[PDB]
Design a protein around this ligand. Sequence first.
Ligand code: FES
Lengths: 128, 193, 68, 307
Amino acid sequence: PPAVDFAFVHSVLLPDGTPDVHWRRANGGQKLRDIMLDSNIELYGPYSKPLSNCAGVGTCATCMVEIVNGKELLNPRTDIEKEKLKRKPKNWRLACQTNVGNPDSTGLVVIQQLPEWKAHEWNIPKNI
Amino acid sequence: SALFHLITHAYSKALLFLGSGSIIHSMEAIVGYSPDKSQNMILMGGLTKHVPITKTAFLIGTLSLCGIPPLACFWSKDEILNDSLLFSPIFAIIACSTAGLTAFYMFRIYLLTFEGHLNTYFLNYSGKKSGSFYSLSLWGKEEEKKLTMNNTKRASFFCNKTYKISNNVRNQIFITVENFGLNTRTFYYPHES
Amino acid sequence: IAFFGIFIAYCLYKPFYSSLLNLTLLNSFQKWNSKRIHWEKLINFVYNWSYNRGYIDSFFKTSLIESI
Amino acid sequence: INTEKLEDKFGRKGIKFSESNNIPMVELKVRNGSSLKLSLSDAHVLSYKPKVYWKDEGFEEVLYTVDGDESRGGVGVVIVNGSSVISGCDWSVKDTDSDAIDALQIELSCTAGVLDITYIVSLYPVSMATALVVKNNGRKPVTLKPGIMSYLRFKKRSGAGIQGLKGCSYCPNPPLSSPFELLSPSEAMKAEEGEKPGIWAVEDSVITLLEKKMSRIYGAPPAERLKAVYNTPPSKFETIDQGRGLFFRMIRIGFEEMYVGSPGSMWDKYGKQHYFVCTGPTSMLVPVDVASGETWRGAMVIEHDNL
Ligand code: FES
């Protein structure tokens, strides 16, 4: 079946000092929030309580996720991600406004959840 | 009844605001000075453990707004609804609904701040606290001289290979350089004002 | 009604390791609401209300001070 | 008192070695009043009293051990092949110069022939870290199955959960045979509601209760054979007490699946107070094979965020 390969590196490093990769399988592209919630990975963080976030529409800047190796199969920034966050390293997208594509999709997007409250910088190779 | 409600509200919500300022000036030691952080109720988290007097003050204030009968001020709202419910159908049942909503959001305000884990030094979210705590590894002398600059550990160096897919490795080599420990290792907890 | 509001706040925001409620009920709470589709509109509208400030500030800053 | 010799060899400011009832034992006390008692020569950590509350004596006991019988109680490391490989009580310290006062570490080491099973008990001011590492020396790859069986005590019989194993699949599977058992593997699946064999089921409860007998293992090693994404199970979860207001987090590193065991109502057959739970990370269904000379690591970390 068409399976998109997520990674979902956690922000907190393990006690070993190495990151943890979880490799969620969830099929197709509808919404990265609904994928991370259906497949049960920590998206919000302390905003995971019910009314502590806008729950999908994009009015808060809470479900922001740093995505690297993700220039391949995404929707572009929908001017809510371009406005609700304005000064970020540009690898950070809101999971409920972004979309990883259509059902017939395969890819290796790696999406560091909770970029706020992190210790690492990811050293993305310079574009162009 | 309006003036008694005003008196109890102005002695309860003023207490809640002074408690909020004490919460805030306890939180500045955590998150520095930023109203999007030092007043953000979500990452206030848990402060019953650290600031107990402010906890009791804010708890008494919020329970006075919810109308708790023995150890708080219910009787103002009691006279309100007693003089209101036999007046009109519109301005009675919706007033009681908003009183229930008042109880809800005020206790949410109390719970998101005081009861729970700190949500800012929480080791499931805060990687800086983790990097500050584990000053040494779990192996001692093995597996490294120490490691910073961990690469894309998508295979975890476990001799794992991919099946028929789009791609497994590529020209994407990104060094996830972690931070250090044993530096500014204090990270003091929120003490009382 | 006040204790009902208190309880709706308690079952959500009080954590499981410190809540005086029984775990057998707290798990059924999320089991009944594991879908989050009918709550994904109610919570959405309530947060939109609280974040747009009832849209009244936007209406005034679009039609009263921008009008002036 | 050989532990006096080990104390003048490796004793530090927060590390205290003791020997009573011919048991070599060590206490690790970090700066914040968090104590950790380990029985040497056995790789069996007994008691763990980390500072939970902000009182003077706010530290609370975590690991369930019975009063006089240290052999049955507390967290212990385990190896099998299919018999207990480390049944020999030949563990010896290796080093302790770990940190100033803040975090301490003991390096036990034994040898089961071609295997040098060395072992790290590290105390950080909020966490136990129990970390095994083995290394082959012979010309045969070994098919060992390791595990770290922890026994956490809860004050209330009804206040028991794990809070975060949802979404990942589980199979009801008996525990690994330990010298530090509390229930045998044959009775852990007996007298239920999960069926004994490895039937697979996706979890649909955000916090699974530990009221019943159900003693299972989370992970899908059948999909691990695929070595695709395979939905790696969560490497951490919040075990809660709810009788007293605290919780803990069991982080697994290197291990693949997570075993949980609820004694159910049959804890009265062994103990009368402090109903417990047998939780630990393992690689049990699909074993681990290192090499004819390589090394393999695996660790379990209990940490609290109450402090
Ligand atoms: S949840 Fe509010 S932005 Fe995605």
